[PDB]
């Protein structure tokens, strides 16, 4: 808790489709939305 701590960590990034939904009074946007993600390959421990 006193000395600075070091460690090797993975870089993490995010990806989104250009789909934006929200709610507001008088808004023209639908309120219920649904999507899916299918996982094809995952290397659990590509690094440490």
């Amino acid at each position: 808790e006193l000395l600075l701590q070091t460690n090797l960590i993975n870089y993490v990034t995010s990806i989104r489709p250009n789909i934006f939904v929200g709610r507001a009074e008088g808004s023209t946007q639908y309120g219920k939305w649904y999507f899916e993600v299918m996982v094809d390959e995952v290397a659990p421990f590509l690094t440490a």
């Binding site: 808790e1 006193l2 600075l4 701590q5 070091t6 460690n7 090797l8 960590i9 993975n10 870089y11 993490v12 990034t13 995010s14 990806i15 989104r16 489709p17 250009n18 789909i19 934006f20 939904v21 929200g22 709610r23 507001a24 009074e25 008088g26 808004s27 023209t28 946007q29 639908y30 309120g31 219920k32 939305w33 649904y34 999507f35 899916e36 993600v37 299918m38 996982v39 094809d40 390959e41 995952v42 290397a43 659990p44 590509l46 690094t47």
Partner: protein, 806 residues
């Protein structure tokens, strides 16, 4: 991470299908794994923005977004009422995968630096037409109301038949059948009434927008001649549209602008009416479901629809002009938007401080991929991240949007750039000059001088720097590969300038102005805010008092201020299961700690929030209020409902000073200080508050191991703003006993040097990684969806500050 139960629990593995459903009405977010419900939900979260699907990952993954329709066939049926996400793509957009808030990209000749992205808001989907109910039509406009009502339908039916629409029993688009393509006086009652009201609304908005219009002709009124449409434009039932011919009516530019405004207002009125009736937007039209592809505010509409609406409104304006009315456009009233703070908007990218050059002749290039707000030049190592480039004396830059040289202000210089133009920046530290070239030609000032700046004091050196505004893209070439420079040979090589990174074995490291608010110690020389450390007296505990130095004077800065104490208090790992002189046993066995905030008389309690923040608080909200606090409830239950737990998570636990102002005192400046005390039981997770010794109704519950910083948010209204009092109460320990292990059993209040006041700073310098994850996104197919792949590992050595959990 909160464990959630699902059949066959396992970390996401190949062939797994995760279904995510968002119901904004509750609001709630629910998950399903391989069709099985995930026994847990997010709910009661903030709704001030737009939600998007997102997947986060490290290297070694391959996933596919399934959004329905032709963008990924769902493997499981959406729950009833939920819409496929592909329907949410906006009219003027094409569905694709993108990163979030990227300051950097790849490009044909190297990395491209990217400025902030212009984001839509949830309020951008609310149509806001101009209010026209009180606009009573003057006699002339009232008279023309019906004629417009008929003529609009005439023109619309002519266009319908020209584009193919023919009369029929029902709206059969497949057979091109329209039931409403008849004479207006015979049009179905509902549509006729709507057309009539819209026709009147056109004149009404004409008046409301500020136009001055009245009769100026009757001879023309009786002279206008109607077009005779042939059998080809005749309907299946024999109906023939009658759009009056007015080929003698010309137009003016301001009138075209007003036509655009009228089209906007009309579309917004229609959208508001449809939303009231219960319609919504959808990329695919569904009339039974009341989903339309055009039910969006005019600004977001597609170009073709905008053109059609503008053409119709221009025809209406022409009809009025042909009637002879004097449609006079209103004067233009200037206004400002400044969506955000300019000083913190543009992203600044600079070379690392260690690359500062204190001598020689140095050259580099900056290609403007866009043509908007961008600045490029040289900066001193101590350049601030929250100041516009060249606003102060710490940078000499050129802005090519209009052509200006920036240093301690702006001056005309050079010429504006075009897309793909390369600005060559040169610094000569022997002559103490700075030169700018555009596509190899030296840019010159109005006086004709060929040096942008002169008499430059070397000081600590100079670094390449650029600034990109929202939506801007640049390409910084520091010349590591001399052959990559495009105009070095034309200008600079023979002049004796050297590429900035000519003989570097590695690319030059860069830093950027990250706009993530962070807490930093109050500067000892801050022009507006001063913090005084007051020692504890016999009747007073240790205190940290904030004062506004420049209050009640010209240049005074009055804005929301977010303060916290440097050290946190940490709740215990395990919570307990289920005179005025301290009693020694109680005071040495207690786990409750206390700290107060004094709001001095003259500082409005309605402008003060007192409490705690977690390490995660990063909101620099200039209009802060307790309703803006991030919050979310995680609810876990059984496979048959039966909620097990409902944990509330937030990053700001505060009370509002306005809750302790008596209604009698409301509206009057009190002459008494308001003392708000905060108590935290580190062994139970309970947080309570008191006002002037009276217990308040606000209470909070946090989970074990939580870290809380004492915090105060205040909008100053007096020279003496607030005071952190690190005192104690009867049988309650001071904050020092919780903060410092050596003082764990010491009841004497203390304020060691480490404990200090920090303020929230909107922008900070952050080092850009030398290498970035290579992510590949592509449309796998109409059934497979959109594939994201990342295979090459990438790691960094992270330095972690324990107390700040950063």
């Amino acid at each position: 991470a909160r464990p959630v139960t699902s059949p066959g629990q396992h970390l996401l593995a190949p062939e797994d299908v995760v279904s995510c459903c968002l119901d904004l009405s509750v609001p709630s977010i629910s998950f399903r794994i391989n069709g099985c419900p995930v026994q847990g939900v997010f709910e009661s979260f903030n709704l001030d923005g737009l939600f998007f699907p997102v997947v986060s990952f490290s290297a070694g993954i391959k996933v596919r977004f399934l959004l329905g329709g032709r963008h990924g066939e769902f493997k499981f049926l959406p729950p009833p009422g939920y819409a496929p996400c592909h329907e949410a793509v906006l009219p003027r957009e094409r569905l694709h995968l993108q990163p979030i808030k990227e300051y950097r990209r790849e490009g044909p000749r190297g990395p491209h630096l990217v400025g902030p992205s212009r984001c839509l808001s949830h309020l951008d989907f609310v149509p806001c037409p101009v209010d026209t109910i009180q606009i009573v039509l003057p006699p002339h406009l009232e008279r023309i109301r019906e004629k417009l009502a008929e003529n609009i339908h005439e023109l619309w039916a002519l266009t319908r038949i020209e584009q193919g629409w023919t009369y029929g029993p029902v709206r059969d688009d497949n057979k091109r059948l329209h039931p409403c393509l008849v004479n207006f006086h015979s049009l179905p009652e509902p549509e006729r009434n709507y057309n009539l009201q819209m026709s009147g609304e056109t004149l009404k908005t004409l008046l409301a927008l500020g136009c001055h219009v009245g009769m100026a002709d009757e001879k023309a009124e009786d002279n206008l001649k109607k077009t005779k449409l042939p059998k080809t434009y005749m309907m299946s039932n024999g109906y023939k549209p009658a759009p009056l011919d007015l080929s003698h009516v010309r137009l003016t530019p301001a009138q075209t602008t007003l036509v655009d405004r009228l089209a906007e207002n009309g579309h917004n009125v229609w959208a508001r009416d449809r939303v009231a009736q219960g319609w919504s937007y959808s990329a695919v039209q569904d009339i039974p479901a009341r989903r339309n592809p055009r039910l969006v505010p005019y600004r977001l509409l597609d170009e073709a629809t905008k053109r059609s609406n503008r053409d119709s409104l221009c025809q209406a304006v022409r009809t009025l002009l042909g009637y002879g009315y004097n449609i006079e456009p209103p004067d233009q009233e200037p206004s400002q938007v400044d969506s955000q703070s300019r000083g913190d908007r543009a992203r600044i990218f600079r070379a690392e401080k260690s690359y500062a050059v204190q001598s020689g002749r140095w050259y580099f290039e900056f290609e403007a991929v866009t043509t908007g707000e961008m600045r490029v030049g040289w900066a001193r190592p101590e350049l601030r991240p929250d100041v516009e480039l060249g606003a102060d004396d710490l940078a000499y830059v050129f802005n090519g949007h209009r052509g200006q040289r920036w240093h301690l202000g702006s001056e005309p210089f050079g010429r504006p750039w075009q897309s793909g133009d390369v600005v060559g920046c040169m610094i000569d530290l022997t002559e103490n000059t700075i030169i700018f070239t555009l596509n190899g030609e030296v840019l010159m000032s109005d006086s004709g001088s060929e040096t942008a700046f002169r008499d430059i004091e070397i000081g600590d050196g100079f670094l390449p720097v650029c600034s990109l505004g929202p939506g801007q893209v640049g390409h910084l070439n520091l010349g590591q590969d001399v052959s990559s420079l495009r105009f070095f040979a034309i200008c600079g090589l023979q002049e004796g300038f050297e590429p900035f990174a000519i003989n570097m074995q590695r690319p030059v490291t860069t830093w950027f102005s990250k706009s993530l608010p962070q807490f930093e110690p109050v500067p000892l020389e801050h022009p507006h805010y001063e913090v005084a450390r007051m020692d504890g007296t016999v009747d007073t505990p240790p205190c940290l008092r904030l004062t506004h130095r420049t209050w009640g004077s010209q240049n005074s800065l009055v804005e929301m201020l977010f303060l916290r104490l440097s050290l946190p208090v940490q709740f215990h790992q395990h919570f307990r299961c289920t005179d005025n002189r301290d009693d020694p046993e109680i005071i040495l066995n207690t786990t409750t700690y206390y700290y107060s905030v004094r709001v001095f008389a003259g500082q409005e309690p309605s402008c003060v929030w007192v409490g705690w923040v977690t390490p995660d608080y990063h909101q620099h909200d200039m209009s802060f209020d307790l309703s803006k606090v991030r919050a979310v409830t995680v609810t876990m239950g059984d496979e048959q409902g039966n909620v097990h737990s409902s944990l509330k998570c937030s990053n700001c636990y505060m009370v509002w000073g306005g809750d302790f102002v008596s209604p009698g005192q409301q509206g009057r400046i009190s002459h008494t200080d308001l003392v708000i005390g905060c108590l935290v039981d580190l062994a139970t997770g309970l947080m309570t508050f008191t006002a002037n010794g009276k217990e308040s109704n606000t209470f909070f519950q946090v989970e074990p191991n939580t870290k809380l910083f004492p915090a105060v948010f205040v909008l100053p209204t007096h020279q003496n703003v607030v005071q952190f009092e690190l005192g104690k109460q009867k049988n309650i320990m001071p904050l020092s006993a919780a903060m410092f292990l050596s003082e764990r059993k010491n009841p004497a209040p203390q304020c060691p040097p480490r404990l200090e006041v920090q303020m929230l700073m909107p922008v900070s310098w952050s080092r850009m990684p030398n290498h970035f994850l290579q992510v590949d996104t592509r449309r796998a197919g109409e059934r497979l969806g959109w594939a994201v792949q990342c295979q090459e590992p990438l790691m960094m050595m992270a330095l972690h500050i324990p107390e700040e959990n950063r």
